[PDB]
Amino acid sequence: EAPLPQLRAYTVDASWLQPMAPLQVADHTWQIGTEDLTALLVQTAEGAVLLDGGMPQMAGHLLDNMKLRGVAPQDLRLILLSHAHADHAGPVAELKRRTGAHVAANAETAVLLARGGSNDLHFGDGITYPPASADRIIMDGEVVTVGGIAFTAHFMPGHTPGSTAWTWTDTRDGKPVRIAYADSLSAPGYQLKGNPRYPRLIEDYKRSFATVRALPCDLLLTPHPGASNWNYAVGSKASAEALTCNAYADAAEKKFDAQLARETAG
Amino acid sequence: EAPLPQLRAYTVDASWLQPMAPLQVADHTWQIGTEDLTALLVQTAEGAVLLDGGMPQMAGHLLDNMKLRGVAPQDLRLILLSHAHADHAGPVAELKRRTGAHVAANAETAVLLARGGSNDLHFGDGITYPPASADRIIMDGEVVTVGGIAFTAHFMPGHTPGSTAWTWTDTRDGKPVRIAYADSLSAPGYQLKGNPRYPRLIEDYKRSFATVRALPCDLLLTPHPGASNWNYAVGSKASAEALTCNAYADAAEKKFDAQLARETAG
Amino acid sequence: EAPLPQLRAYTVDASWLQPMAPLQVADHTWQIGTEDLTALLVQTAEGAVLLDGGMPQMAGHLLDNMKLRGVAPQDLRLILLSHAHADHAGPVAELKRRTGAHVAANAETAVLLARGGSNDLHFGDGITYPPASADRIIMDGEVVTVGGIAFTAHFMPGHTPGSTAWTWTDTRDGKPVRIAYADSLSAPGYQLKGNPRYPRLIEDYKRSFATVRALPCDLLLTPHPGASNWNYAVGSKASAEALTCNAYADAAEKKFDAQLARETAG
Amino acid sequence: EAPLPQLRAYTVDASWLQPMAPLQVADHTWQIGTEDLTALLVQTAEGAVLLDGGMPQMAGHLLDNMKLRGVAPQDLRLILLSHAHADHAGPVAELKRRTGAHVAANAETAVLLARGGSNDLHFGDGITYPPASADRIIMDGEVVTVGGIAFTAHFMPGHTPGSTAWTWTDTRDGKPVRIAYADSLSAPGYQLKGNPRYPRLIEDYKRSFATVRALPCDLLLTPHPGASNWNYAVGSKASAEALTCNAYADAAEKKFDAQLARETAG
Ligand SMILES: C=C1CO[C@H]([C@@](C=O)(NC(=O)[C@H](C(=O)O)c2ccc(O)cc2)OC)N=C1C(=O)O
Ligand SMILES: C=C1CO[C@H]([C@@](C=O)(NC(=O)[C@H](C(=O)O)c2ccc(O)cc2)OC)N=C1C(=O)O
Ligand SMILES: C=C1CO[C@H]([C@@](C=O)(NC(=O)[C@H](C(=O)O)c2ccc(O)cc2)OC)N=C1C(=O)O
Ligand SMILES: C=C1CO[C@H]([C@@](C=O)(NC(=O)[C@H](C(=O)O)c2ccc(O)cc2)OC)N=C1C(=O)O
Ligand SMILES: [Cu+2]
Ligand SMILES: [Cu+2]
Ligand SMILES: [Cu+2]
Ligand SMILES: [Cu+2]
Ligand SMILES: [Cu+2]
Ligand SMILES: [Cu+2]
Ligand SMILES: [Cu+2]
Ligand SMILES: [Cu+2]
């Protein structure tokens, strides 16, 4: 008789786990994750902010890169998240323990983060990571300020119920740069139509496409750089082919509409 | 350059995942886990109790065996735990969702269960499972009653800070049978001496050896059946060579004292 | 020198704490709360459901009324909530401990319930109650079924971020009765315009007015009976003057628009 | 017919809420609470530590006193607790939100803190406060270090299951001062004998008396200053009549033994 199957680990492409040196996005914003996973460090006078952290095993690499930027572990004051999946919020638990930073997230992301990604509406328990607790609950449009830099949350439910875009204004060449960190708009293997765990899934994606179009957006970044056409490996040319917020939302909606029709035919 | 390592899954010996039919221990107590992982079902007039559930992937098998015993999913009223490691408390989250049962545990096991086993004092994040919440906090010596069957908790810290033994009185051949479900007394790969995460580790193990000796104990069971010399596969002869509570505690202390001396010499 | 002020208790009108006998709403739906606080019991073949529980001190009275209906404590399987304020979700913690029932709520209500109502966006810590944990997270439009009776959740954010309406179909005189339990639409003392803790507060109220209008609604009930023109004290004539769902939403929007203009002028 | 009783607020003697200016205990240790509630600030080069915070309404006063000591809100790095009752851990939730400090506590205190003091083993829901989460779980004897100052936890269960004494070495007149912050040893209105919620209550108190006797103790402080014979109001003479650790434990045990005999006779 066959035994019950062994637990399967969440494996990803090697480029998602390929460390990279800090890549400057603007005067205070740096990509410090891996080549295929975004992790943004915003350095203020009163401490540092981290948006996403990638996979669980990236915690040490993030702290190494923070130190290359002159940010001691205890100088990290705040962790912000796009959504609480293992490949974006993986190391949050370990980062909280080692930095003393607080996590700000909306209620849906907080509840998912507190489950460690277990009981996913679409993936079940296949992408579990160490759970972490949110210290501040964020509402739609709420402003989070660290060192005088205002971060504004824009709810874009879909990929996860708590999917959030974060916008803030940096500088470059003495001119303002409105950075938009928009969450994923994919639905990989999701059941879209008549989903009992997510009955309004299609309506949420539709409004989220419109939300992404209206974001203040001089420079767009996404948790997966390829989604917005970044290439973190080519250095100072990484952002050359980056999409607008309008192009990102439009490309996402056509892929969504094609998958929706394919689901009807499958 | 080498990428960061992929996540490693918690793999175990095949016999830990080998399903078995319900094996009767006493008039109301059944082993319904696998051949090498204990999961005890106690059936009362007012519902069923489950002590431990084994690995995360055993949830369906447990519910199948409960149904073979005539226990519908919603008839499970209470889940009790020896300790909150992935191979004993793995399926607790899924069982709560599908049965409506409550979990009773002490504070140390509840805090570990709420982390999904992450941030283990000795194993780090290597044995993470879906986290679950305790509905009732139990003190040492406290009695938990379901259907008129009294379960008494005996704290035996060591293997985990929350390690607990559960005792209750069943019947067999019209005579009382005092069953003792004692937790693991192993320290596999632990640092025993001068452990900053567990400074009183040795003192706790010592008192726990004495606690196990004094348990009301006509029949001893352990989360790993081989620890108490059970053999779930040979059917009605499974308990023939089972150890006493005194023999279990004594065998454990000698292994502990030998490992302690080996640690001094290693 | 004056000392710091003593803690102030959450006091309410006496009629909110005036016990009443079970009042039948339909074949399986009963009001079992107080004269001015709704607490609905739906009795199925496979257990009972409770929607709201009123104040913290109502826990014993609810269990007394459940027993008058023939519902033993352990027969309560599910607790549903309009919103997690002290006067509607007060006794949830005690009810879970004594009945083994599970709580189903959306993420916003779960996070507020887990704080015991502390850190309210508008009331601060003035209405704290014993906190409780949600066992199942509910999405908008999701169906929750107990004993074959389907409960559908309709998010109506505003009074609280997690404010929810619950709809289900009962019977009476052999004919179907579509009951709508709609949450509060008041904003008592709220700052509506430019609220940093709730920047989209006005937009949420507006959509919630439209959501209430579109509910399947043969009979409307609200957490405060006077909001829908019930009078629980006059017995079998309690529902005579009850409002429609359209009249409730319209009366609420005019009060909201008048308060919004008064806020501009105050 | 009488209505259900209104909620009763946790009121205390005025002196528990009488603010006081910072009173220096040693080179880096200050009493910054009220006249009858201890709240200790330890200032290091790398941030500040707070042991206990008193009542919920003391949060603002604590931050005012921290600022008088030159400690900005975000400079508070760690909150430590004797036990999680409303008059000692009241403002922890608000302090975390406004300072970004982490809370370190054992599992029993963390579980009680997470309930906001509700479901007390002896007081029920009479002393509920805003709940807070522990960021680091502490074991017995574990060392917590901030700015090079080592804090050692000594479990003394009794007053609460998680009751903890904190010891550290400060300086004064160039000589070391071993400060012991020992928790309460009272059992006000407790049922000591055969308590189903706390069956080993008497054994825990007995061991805790011995634990307090053996503490490194040049200067003893307690959460209630009168328990160790401090008088915070008389300024630089506040510690003149302070008890030793041995005298405190002995005075507590005689009061405990007299109450135990009175309980047998009552
Ligand atoms: C579109 C993608 C690419 O896939 C990742 C995702 C889905 O969110 N899935 C995966 O990593 C795998 C996949 O989708 O095949 C996977 C592997 C194992 C498993 O059990 C579940 C999923 O991350 C969880 N994220 C995005 C995004 O846009 O964010
Ligand atoms: C003495 C044992 C045998 O090992 C299991 C244990 C340790 O508790 N470890 C393991 O399963 C593995 C092992 O110990 O080698 C393991 C594998 C991977 C890993 O990352 C960590 C541990 O269960 C977690 N339990 C007991 C017990 O007496 O309960
Ligand atoms: C419109 C009302 C009437 O008031 C209650 C409310 C507000 O939600 N407030 C109160 O009970 C008091 C009030 O509003 O004056 C109060 C008293 C003390 C306090 O610290 C805060 C509020 O319940 C919390 N609920 C509704 C509802 O529609 O649900
Ligand atoms: C010995 C005392 C004095 O009382 C406080 C206590 C008990 O811990 N109780 C009280 O404050 C009141 C009392 O004991 O009468 C009280 C008031 C209302 C209530 O509902 C419960 C208790 O704090 C909770 N602490 C200690 C200690 O040694 O720490
Ligand atoms: Cu994702
Ligand atoms: Cu992803
Ligand atoms: Cu183990
Ligand atoms: Cu094991
Ligand atoms: Cu309300
Ligand atoms: Cu109300
Ligand atoms: Cu106390
Ligand atoms: Cu006290």
Residue tagged 């409004």 (tokens):
A207
Give me the sign of the Cα torsion angle D213, D218, D223, D224.
positive
- The DSSP code for B223 is S
CA–CA distance, B25 with B40 (Å, rounded to integer): 9
B162 Cα to the center of ligand 9, angstroms? 39
CA D177 to chain centre: 20
CA D166 to chain centre: 9
* SS3 label, residue B81: coil
Residue tagged 């394919």 (tokens):
A262
> Could you tell me which residues are beta bridge partners of residue B165?
B154
Nearest to B133 among C47, C74, C133 (CB): C133
First to last CA, chain A: 34
The CATH homologous superfamily of the domain defined by B1-266: Ribonuclease Z/Hydroxyacylglutathione hydrolase-like (3.60.15.10)
Joined tokens for residue A205: 């994606």
Report yes or no: D159 and D184 within 8 Å, Cβ to Cβ. Answer: yes
* SS3 label, residue D104: strand
Joined tokens for residue C245: 């769902």
Residue tagged 């899924």 (tokens):
B94
- Return left, alpha or beta for C249; rule: phi > 0 is left, psi -120 to 50 is alpha, else beta: alpha
* SS3 label, residue D263: helix
* Burial class of residue A39, CB neighbours in 10 A (0-12, 13-18, 19+): buried
Does the distance separating the beta carbons of C4 and D58 come in below 8 Å? Answer: yes
CA–CA distance, D129 with D10 (Å, rounded to integer): 9
* SS3 label, residue B76: strand
Closest among D36, D21, D24, D82 to D231, alpha carbons compared: D36
Beta strands in chain D (DSSP E): 23-24, 29-31, 40-44, 47-51, 76-80, 102-105, 136-137, 143-146, 149-155, 164-172, 175-181, 219-221
Closest among C195, C62, B108 to D105, alpha carbons compared: B108
Angle (CA) C175 C176 C177, round 5°: 120
CA–CA distance, B227 with B250 (Å, rounded to integer): 12
Residue D141: list chain B partners with CB under 8 A.
199-200
CA–CA distance, D218 with A170 (Å, rounded to integer): 54
Contact of B61 with chain A, judged by CB distance below 8 Å, is answered with yes
Number of helices followed by number of strands (H, E) in chain A: 6, 12
CA–CA distance, D17 with C2 (Å, rounded to integer): 9
CA–CA distance, B147 with B149 (Å, rounded to integer): 6
The β-bridge relationship of strands B149-155 and B164-172 is antiparallel
Closest among A98, A99, A79, A74 to A89, alpha carbons compared: A79
Reported for B11-19, long-range contacts at CB under 8 A and 24+ positions apart, including other chains, are B11/A6, B11/A7, B12/A6, B12/B55, B12/B87, B14/A3, B15/A3, B16/B54, B16/B55, B16/B87, B17/A3, B17/A4, B17/A5, B17/A6, B17/B55, B17/B57, B17/B58, B18/A1, B18/A3, B18/A4, B19/A1, B19/A3, B19/A4, B19/B61
CA–CA distance, A102 with B174 (Å, rounded to integer): 60
Report yes or no: B208 and B245 within 8 Å, Cβ to Cβ. Answer: no
> Could you tell me which residues are beta bridge partners of residue C176?
C171
CA–CA distance, B6 with B146 (Å, rounded to integer): 45
Phi/psi of residue A137, each to 5°? -90, 130
C110 Cα to the center of ligand 3, angstroms? 20
Q: Residue D2: CB partners within 8 Å, gap ≥ 6? A: none
CA–CA distance, D48 with D25 (Å, rounded to integer): 15
CA–CA distance, C55 with C14 (Å, rounded to integer): 12
Residue C210, CB-side half-sphere exposure with 13 Å CA sphere: 5
Q: Residue C2: CB partners within 8 Å, gap ≥ 6? A: none
CA–CA distance, A140 with A262 (Å, rounded to integer): 33
* Alpha-carbon distance B35 to nearest alpha carbon in chain D (angstroms): 33
Residue type at position B60: G
Residue A102: list chain D partners with CB under 8 A.
100
Beta-carbon contacts below 8 Å between B and C: 22
Closest among A141, A134, A131 to A165, alpha carbons compared: A141
Angle (CA) C188 C194 C196, round 5°: 90
Contact of D122 with chain A, judged by CB distance below 8 Å, is answered with no
* Burial class of residue B152, CB neighbours in 10 A (0-12, 13-18, 19+): buried
Report yes or no: B127 and B139 within 8 Å, Cβ to Cβ. Answer: no
Closest among C50, C89, C96, C52 to C71, alpha carbons compared: C50
State the DSSP H helix or E strand holding residue B252, giving kind and residue range, or none if neither: helix B245-264
Would you say the CB of residue A184 lies under 6 angstroms from ligand 1?
A: yes
Would you say the CB of residue A16 lies under 6 angstroms from ligand 1?
A: no
Q: Which of residues 90-119 of D touch A (CB under 8 A)?
A: 96-97, 100-102
CA–CA distance, C130 with D130 (Å, rounded to integer): 9
Closest among C186, C156, C188 to C82, alpha carbons compared: C156
* Burial class of residue C71, CB neighbours in 10 A (0-12, 13-18, 19+): buried
CA–CA distance, C49 with C198 (Å, rounded to integer): 32
- What does the DSSP assignment read for A11-38? ---GGGG-B---EESSSSEEE-SBSSS-
Beta strands in B182-247 (DSSP E): 219-221
Nearest to D7 among C56, C125, C131 (CB): C56
- What does the DSSP assignment read for B102-161? EEEE-HHHHHHHHTTT-SBTTTBTTT-------SEE--TT-EEEETTEEEEEEE--SSST
CA D53 to chain centre: 8
Nearest to B128 among A1, A4, A128 (CB): A128
Does the distance separating the beta carbons of D110 and B139 come in below 8 Å? Answer: no
CA–CA distance, C164 with C145 (Å, rounded to integer): 17
Closest among B145, B162, B138 to B89, alpha carbons compared: B162
Joined tokens for residue D104: 């370190």
Q: Residue D122: CB partners within 8 Å, gap ≥ 6? A: D189, D190, D191, D197
Report yes or no: A172 and A26 within 8 Å, Cβ to Cβ. Answer: yes
What is the three-state SS of chain C?
A: CCCCCCCCCCCCCHHHHCECCCEECCCCEEECCECCCCCEEEEECCEEEEECCECHHHHHHHHHHHHHCCCCHHHEEEEECCCCCHHHHCCHHHHHHHHCCEEEECHHHHHHHHCCCCCECCCECCCCCCCCCCCEECCCCCEEEECCEEEEEEECCCCCCCCEEEEEEEEECCEEEEEEECCCCCCCCCCCCCECCECCHHHHHHHHHHHHHCCCCCEEECCCHHHHCCCHHHHHHCCCCCCCHHHHHHHHHHHHHHHHHHHHCC
Neighbouring C-beta atoms of residue B11, cutoff 10 Å? 12
Ligand closest to A184 (CA) is: 1
Closest among A47, A11, A50, A211 to A132, alpha carbons compared: A50
Joined tokens for residue A190: 């999701």
Does the distance separating the beta carbons of C140 and A199 come in below 8 Å? Answer: yes
CA A143 to chain centre: 18
* Alpha-carbon distance A106 to nearest alpha carbon in chain C (angstroms): 8
Tell me the longest C-alpha to C-alpha distance in chain C: 70
Does the distance separating the beta carbons of D136 and A97 come in below 8 Å? Answer: yes
* SS3 label, residue B79: strand
CA A235 to chain centre: 21
CA–CA distance, C50 with C43 (Å, rounded to integer): 9
Report yes or no: D219 and D178 within 8 Å, Cβ to Cβ. Answer: yes
CA–CA distance, A129 with A109 (Å, rounded to integer): 14
Buried b / exposed e over B24-44, threshold 16 CB at 10 Å, is ebbebbbbbbbbbbbbbbbbb
CA–CA distance, B90 with B100 (Å, rounded to integer): 17
Nearest CA in chain C to D19: C3
Residue tagged 């929750």 (tokens):
C144
Report yes or no: C33 and C54 within 8 Å, Cβ to Cβ. Answer: yes
What resolution in angstrom units was achieved for this structure?
A: 2.4
Q: Residue B188: CB partners within 8 Å, gap ≥ 6? A: none
CA–CA distance, A213 with B201 (Å, rounded to integer): 57
Give me the sign of the Cα torsion angle B51, B54, B56, B60.
negative
CA–CA distance, B169 with B83 (Å, rounded to integer): 21
Closest among A61, A21, A5 to A238, alpha carbons compared: A21
Closest among B246, B211, B80, B227 to B150, alpha carbons compared: B80
* Alpha-carbon distance C141 to nearest alpha carbon in chain A (angstroms): 6
Does the distance separating the beta carbons of D9 and C19 come in below 8 Å? Answer: no
CA–CA distance, D95 with D33 (Å, rounded to integer): 14
Residue B175, CB-side half-sphere exposure with 13 Å CA sphere: 3
Residue tagged 């964020």 (tokens):
A138
First to last CA, chain D: 34
First to last CA, chain B: 34
Cα distances (Å, whole numbers) of residue B84 to B81, B183, B201, C183: 7, 11, 17, 39
Would you say the CB of residue C85 lies under 6 angstroms from ligand 3?
A: yes
* Alpha-carbon distance A121 to nearest alpha carbon in chain B (angstroms): 14
- What does the DSSP assignment read for A187-245? -TT---TTBTTBTTHHHHHHHHHHHHHTS--SEEE-SSGGGGT--GGGGGGTTTTPPPH
Task: State which approach was used to obtain the coordinates.
Answer: X-ray
CA–CA distance, D80 with D51 (Å, rounded to integer): 5
> Could you tell me which residues are beta bridge partners of residue A51?
A40, A80
Residue type at position B175: K
C39 Cα to the center of ligand 10, angstroms? 12
Residue C107: list chain A partners with CB under 8 A.
107-108, 110-111, 161-162
Joined tokens for residue D22: 């910072």
> Could you tell me which residues are beta bridge partners of residue B96?
none
Does the distance separating the beta carbons of C17 and D93 come in below 8 Å? Answer: no
Helices D107-114 and B107-114: angle between axes, nearest 10 degrees: 70
The β-bridge relationship of strands D149-155 and D143-146 is antiparallel
> Could you tell me which residues are beta bridge partners of residue A151?
A144
The β-bridge relationship of strands B143-146 and B149-155 is antiparallel
Joined tokens for residue C60: 């014993």
State the DSSP H helix or E strand holding residue A59, giving kind and residue range, or none if neither: helix A59-68
Q: After which residues does chain C become discontinuous at a C–N distance over 2.5 Å? A: none
Closest among C184, C205, C197, C13 to C83, alpha carbons compared: C184
Q: Residue D83: CB partners within 8 Å, gap ≥ 6? A: D89, D109, D112, D159, D160, D162, D163, D164, D183, D184, D223
